[PDB]
Design a binder for this molecule. Structure first.
Ligand SMILES: Cc1cc2nc3c(=O)[nH]c(=O)nc-3n(C[C@H](O)[C@H](O)[C@H](O)COP(=O)(O)OP(=O)(O)OC[C@H]3O[C@@H](n4cnc5c(N)ncnc54)[C@H](O)[C@@H]3O)c2cc1C
Ligand SMILES: Cc1cc2nc3c(=O)[nH]c(=O)nc-3n(C[C@H](O)[C@H](O)[C@H](O)COP(=O)(O)OP(=O)(O)OC[C@H]3O[C@@H](n4cnc5c(N)ncnc54)[C@H](O)[C@@H]3O)c2cc1C
Ligand SMILES: CN(C)c1ccc2cc3ccc(N(C)C)cc3[nH+]c2c1
Ligand SMILES: CN(C)c1ccc2cc3ccc(N(C)C)cc3[nH+]c2c1
Ligand SMILES: [Zn+2]
Ligand SMILES: [Zn+2]
Ligand SMILES: [Zn+2]
Lengths: 230, 230
């Protein structure tokens, strides 16, 4: 439909449940005629660490290194490391960014956290001021497709993990909404590692099926109320 | 009374506000007679990525790589990578683990997320059974000392960031409580970057003064109610 999709994918194993969800996404969006790009972070050996190597030009303050300050200035000067600007090009061109990952400690795997830390820099993804609904990636969509060890039941208000929406807050609100994304409803595939084959098949089909009508979805209200209720 | 403290520290710059807070902790805990160890992650060029390099020798299934399974087995077989087991030794010996870090996207910097992902493996930090109250690090204390870009006001329930307790949930509950830590109240130093020198000195003194009686502290009730309730 003229639409461009970036999938940022964070799993080590192509045959994994995550690998299958990523491939289903590529297959279905490709079938629709979408332009599709995948950043396979582990295969890229993507650098997760925020360091002074991310700036190649003269530092604003070479005596006391401030990562946010220096990357902001390097973005404006175009002296960021090229692995960062490679990702920024993908994001800039994308209409929808899908994140495909296993839940690691109620969050993204570190290699994907590094992508968020390094790619979404000041000047590119937001400004101060110029964030949340004024973020610089406004007009773009984002979607978290996450798999969990824990069951849906564990991820309820009265379950040991609390509601699943609780752990989405830093990702959907603190990061994506902050940068101006509108956020589509998460795809959460609960506990595939202990699900039956039928249940596993059912979770993969649910995702493929959803993707058929993804461009007709409205985003969530990315608010404290949506995440926490009551 | 010989208490052992591990400080896991994630900042690039010794002269930073985080650097000063880390140094205050070392100084004060050292003064008290405590045994103190610091894992300076950036200085160590600590590996954040969860990969098959974290298992030495032969994988337990060389055709389909499952990080969780492989590291569980490697832990039991004494064949984890030495950077991991070095950290596990420090944690094993510690009575208190302090994490010192700037807030990156409502969470820990990726290098510290990588520490959590790779060090806190099944068999070491948790198991079936042994999680939440019975996690394998029960008896230990953990404390998050965080600095933010955003103001205290932004981190209120109706402020644009929401309550700071909202972003603590994945860290304190999903990670630390899950491994059996009792969680000490977080230390949150709001917006040192725009604070006055006097305000900044006050935040450092608050931390130094808190450390004087840290062994007298009651842990928080690490509950959904604490994080999300009234
Ligand atoms: C460091 C770390 C931290 C973690 N922290 C948390 C946490 O805080 N909370 C939590 O809930 N979980 C946590 N987990 C667990 C983790 O989220 C799950 O193990 C992960 O989400 C499972 O996804 P996967 O792709 O690895 O599953 P896989 O093990 O790859 O897949 C599960 C099963 O599905 C099968 N499968 C693959 N493709 C298909 C297909 N096409 N059709 C049918 N079946 C298929 C696979 O063969 C496998 O048998 C953590 C794990 C690690 C390693
Ligand atoms: C990738 C990224 C993502 C981020 N995401 C978020 C986010 O989601 N939410 C949010 O709120 N913020 C976010 N931030 C901002 C970040 O949390 C703050 O910039 C950081 O906490 C500032 O801490 P610092 O140690 O670097 O401060 P510094 O810049 O090092 O210090 C502030 C001032 O204190 C001074 N100082 C140092 N030592 C002392 C001392 N002993 N006594 C008095 N003054 C002293 C310093 O010289 C400096 O002038 C993000 C930043 C980055 C880079
Ligand atoms: C009901 N099931 C199957 C679950 C439920 C919760 C879980 C929580 C985890 C936390 C960390 C972790 N690793 C560090 C590997 C693996 C986990 N596996 C889980 C599996
Ligand atoms: C009240 N002030 C000054 C603030 C408030 C919120 C902020 C949020 C941020 C998010 C990411 C980031 N980086 C990616 C550098 C820098 C941020 N700086 C902030 C500064
Ligand atoms: Zn939001
Ligand atoms: Zn075990
Ligand atoms: Zn808890």
């Amino acid at each position: 439909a003229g639409k461009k999709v970036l999938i940022v994918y964070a799993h080590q194993e192509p045959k994994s449940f995550n690998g299958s969800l990523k491939n289903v996404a590529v297959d279905e969006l490709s079938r629709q005629g979408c332009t599709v790009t995948v950043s396979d972070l582990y295969a890229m050996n993507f650098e997760p660490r925020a360091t002074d190597k991310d700036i190649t030009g003269t530092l604003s303050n070479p005596e006391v290194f401030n990562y946010g300050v220096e990357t902001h200035e390097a973005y404006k000067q175009r002296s960021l490391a090229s692995d960062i600007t490679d990702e920024q090009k993908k994001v800039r061109e994308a209409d929808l960014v899908i994140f495909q990952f296993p839940l690691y400690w109620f969050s993204v795997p570190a290699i994907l956290k590094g992508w968020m830390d390094r790619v979404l820099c000041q000047g590119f993804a937001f400004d101060i001021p110029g964030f949340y609904d004024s973020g610089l990636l406004q007009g773009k969509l984002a979607l978290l497709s996450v798999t969990t060890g824990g069951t849906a039941e564990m991820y309820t208000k009265t379950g040991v993990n609390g509601d699943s929406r609780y752990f989405l807050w830093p990702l959907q609100h603190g990061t994506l909404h902050f940068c101006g994304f509108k956020v589509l409803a998460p795809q959460i595939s609960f506990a595939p590692e202990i699900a039956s084959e039928e249940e596993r098949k059912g979770m993969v089909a649910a995702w493929s099926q959803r993707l058929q009508t993804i461009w007709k979805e409205e985003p969530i209200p990315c608010t404290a109320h949506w995440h926490f209720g009551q």
